[PDB]
Design an enzyme around this catalytic site. Structure first.
Site, PDB file in Angstrom:
ATOM      1  N   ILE A  10      -2.740   7.710   4.240  1.00  0.00           N
ATOM      2  CA  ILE A  10      -1.327   7.475   4.505  1.00  0.00           C
ATOM      3  C   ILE A  10      -0.478   7.522   3.241  1.00  0.00           C
ATOM      4  CG2 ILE A  10      -1.657   6.185   6.643  1.00  0.00           C
ATOM      5  CD1 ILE A  10      -1.679   3.641   5.181  1.00  0.00           C
ATOM      6  N   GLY A  11      -0.983   8.204   2.217  1.00  0.00           N
ATOM      7  CA  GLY A  11      -0.221   8.330   0.988  1.00  0.00           C
ATOM      8  C   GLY A  11      -0.899   8.001  -0.324  1.00  0.00           C
ATOM      9  N   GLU A  12      -0.212   8.354  -1.408  1.00  0.00           N
ATOM     10  CA  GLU A  12      -0.692   8.091  -2.756  1.00  0.00           C
ATOM     11  C   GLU A  12       0.120   6.894  -3.248  1.00  0.00           C
ATOM     12  OE1 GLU A  12      -3.002  10.791  -3.418  1.00  0.00           O
ATOM     13  OE2 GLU A  12      -2.281  11.210  -1.381  1.00  0.00           O
ATOM     14  N   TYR A  15      -0.797   2.141  -6.895  1.00  0.00           N
ATOM     15  CA  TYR A  15      -2.025   2.043  -7.681  1.00  0.00           C
ATOM     16  C   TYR A  15      -3.179   2.886  -7.144  1.00  0.00           C
ATOM     17  CZ  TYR A  15       0.376  -2.199  -9.388  1.00  0.00           C
ATOM     18  OH  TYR A  15       1.275  -3.106  -9.909  1.00  0.00           O
ATOM     19  N   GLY A  16      -2.870   4.001  -6.492  1.00  0.00           N
ATOM     20  CA  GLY A  16      -3.924   4.844  -5.960  1.00  0.00           C
ATOM     21  C   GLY A  16      -3.698   5.270  -4.523  1.00  0.00           C
ATOM     22  N   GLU A  73      -3.310  -6.297   5.688  1.00  0.00           N
ATOM     23  CA  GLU A  73      -2.956  -6.286   7.104  1.00  0.00           C
ATOM     24  C   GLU A  73      -2.115  -5.003   7.233  1.00  0.00           C
ATOM     25  OE1 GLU A  73       0.534  -8.533   8.824  1.00  0.00           O
ATOM     26  OE2 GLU A  73       0.534  -9.509   6.874  1.00  0.00           O
ATOM     27  N   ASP A 119       8.028  -4.938  -8.943  1.00  0.00           N
ATOM     28  CA  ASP A 119       8.297  -3.557  -8.578  1.00  0.00           C
ATOM     29  C   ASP A 119       8.758  -3.375  -7.137  1.00  0.00           C
ATOM     30  OD1 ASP A 119       8.516  -0.807  -9.127  1.00  0.00           O
ATOM     31  OD2 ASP A 119       6.508  -0.460  -8.279  1.00  0.00           O
ATOM     32  N   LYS A 121      10.756  -2.187  -3.972  1.00  0.00           N
ATOM     33  CA  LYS A 121      11.428  -0.952  -3.616  1.00  0.00           C
ATOM     34  C   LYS A 121      11.249  -0.804  -2.113  1.00  0.00           C
ATOM     35  CE  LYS A 121       7.376   1.325  -5.560  1.00  0.00           C
ATOM     36  NZ  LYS A 121       6.987   2.315  -6.618  1.00  0.00           N
TER      37      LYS A 121
HETATM   38  N1  X9I Z   1      -0.211  -2.554   4.590  1.00  0.00           N
HETATM   39  C1  X9I Z   1       0.196  -1.343   5.040  1.00  0.00           C
HETATM   40  O1  X9I Z   1       0.211  -1.092   6.352  1.00  0.00           O
HETATM   41  C2  X9I Z   1       0.679  -0.299   4.100  1.00  0.00           C
HETATM   42  C3  X9I Z   1       0.086  -0.276   2.800  1.00  0.00           C
HETATM   43  C4  X9I Z   1       0.490   0.676   1.810  1.00  0.00           C
HETATM   44  N2  X9I Z   1      -0.100   0.671   0.550  1.00  0.00           N
HETATM   45  O2  X9I Z   1       0.268   1.553  -0.388  1.00  0.00           O
HETATM   46  O3  X9I Z   1      -1.055  -0.218   0.240  1.00  0.00           O
HETATM   47  C5  X9I Z   1       1.506   1.621   2.142  1.00  0.00           C
HETATM   48  C6  X9I Z   1       2.115   1.623   3.424  1.00  0.00           C
HETATM   49  C7  X9I Z   1       1.724   0.658   4.454  1.00  0.00           C
HETATM   50  N3  X9I Z   1       2.274   0.618   5.672  1.00  0.00           N
HETATM   51  C8  X9I Z   1       3.373   1.439   6.187  1.00  0.00           C
HETATM   52  C9  X9I Z   1       2.987   2.825   6.613  1.00  0.00           C
HETATM   53  C10 X9I Z   1       1.989   3.036   7.617  1.00  0.00           C
HETATM   54  C11 X9I Z   1       1.645   4.357   8.017  1.00  0.00           C
HETATM   55  C12 X9I Z   1       2.301   5.496   7.413  1.00  0.00           C
HETATM   56  C13 X9I Z   1       2.006   6.892   7.774  1.00  0.00           C
HETATM   57  O4  X9I Z   1       1.143   7.097   8.651  1.00  0.00           O
HETATM   58  O5  X9I Z   1       2.625   7.826   7.197  1.00  0.00           O
HETATM   59  C14 X9I Z   1       3.296   5.258   6.407  1.00  0.00           C
HETATM   60  C15 X9I Z   1       3.634   3.939   6.015  1.00  0.00           C
END
Ligand code: X9I
EC number: 2.7.11.22
Length: 282
Positions: A10-12, A15-16, A73, A119, A121
């Site tokens: 679900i992304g970069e 921290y990784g 979570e 940080d 945002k």
């Molecule tokens: N706890 C977390 O659910 C979460 C965690 C992160 N992260 O970088 O550790 C980043 C985004 C997060 N949720 C929002 C989210 C969920 C799914 C998608 C997607 O499927 O594109 C995008 C953002």
């Protein structure tokens, strides 16, 4: 991770890389962040005790095969996406207020426990279908630290101060509050100096009168141009005076004059706060 079933990347993250994953045993759906020091392990571990409804829960810290994974979570959407999705009509004021109020509750909690975010945002503010918003990544900057978005960085960080205080989070949140209102980032700098000068161009170049000690900051230069301050009425129109008053207190230059999360919760702007249901398309 054999215990997990990666549903998808679900992304970069900051921290990784981060994945949405399902615990093969418990069946729970979580966010798994694989991070790029025993000191960090202990600090990070302490954050597992930091529970509050407006803070994304850190479920586990896994240090195995000499790699670091953070299990959080899961929430389906972040505020950055929600703002883009709401760009045509804007987020309704009651929802902006609910979100700001919840975020301040989250900050008040973390700050009362001596934990700073550093940080904040839109990307690390997560939301759900029930109208809740939660702060993600609290405490990681300190536990770690050492293209990055500078848009929400407090001026004391940009001027080279080495000791951050809770005030940096209030500054970032004020920038986010403004952005939800105007539907445009407040200070979209593309370099550290452009960031700083965008702040100066709007709030006025700071001086010893409004910020005692500013001219002695590490990166302060007497050569900085001297810009006059603009009026908030021009900065976040059409936000009302309760809102402008609170924003002005969240954006004071002197970190010591900047309003605290606890004090902000008591601001008249929240007299009529409610908890609306957002229109979320998942
Ligand atoms: N706890 C977390 O659910 C979460 C965690 C992160 N992260 O970088 O550790 C980043 C985004 C997060 N949720 C929002 C989210 C969920 C799914 C998608 C997607 O499927 O594109 C995008 C953002």
């Amino acid at each position: 991770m054999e215990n997990f079933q990666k549903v998808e990347k679900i992304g970069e993250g900051t921290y990784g890389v981060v994945y949405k994953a399902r615990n093969k045993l418990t069946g729970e759906v979580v966010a798994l962040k694989k991070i790029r020091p025993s000191t960090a392990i202990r600090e990070i571990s302490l954050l597992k005790e930091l529970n509050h409804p407006n803070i994304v829960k850190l479920l586990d810290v896994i240090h195995t095969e000499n790699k670091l994974y953070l299990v959080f979570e899961f929430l389906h959407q972040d505020l950055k996406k929600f703002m883009d999705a709401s760009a045509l009509t804007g987020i309704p004021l009651p929802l902006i207020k609910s979100y700001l109020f919840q975020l301040l509750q989250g900050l008040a909690f973390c700050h009362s426990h001596r934990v700073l975010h550093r940080d904040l945002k839109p990307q690390n503010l997560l939301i759900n279908t029930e109208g809740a918003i939660k702060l993600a990544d609290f405490g990681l900057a300190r536990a770690f630290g050492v293209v990055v978005t500078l848009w929400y960085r407090a001026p004391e960080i940009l001027l080279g101060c080495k000791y951050y205080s809770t005030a940096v989070d209030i500054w970032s949140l004020g920038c986010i509050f403004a952005e939800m209102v105007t539907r445009r980032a407040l200070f979209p700098g593309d370099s550290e100096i452009d960031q700083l000068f965008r702040i100066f161009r709007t709030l006025g170049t700071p001086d010893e009168v409004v910020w005692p000690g500013v001219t002695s900051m590490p990166d302060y230069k007497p050569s900085f141009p001297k810009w006059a301050r603009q009026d908030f009425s021009k900065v976040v129109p059409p936000l009302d005076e309760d809102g402008r008053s609170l924003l002005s207190q969240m954006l004071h230059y002197d970190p010591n004059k900047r309003i605290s999360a606890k004090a902000a919760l008591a601001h008249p702007f929240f007299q009529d706060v409610t908890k609306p249901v957002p229109h979320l398309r998942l």
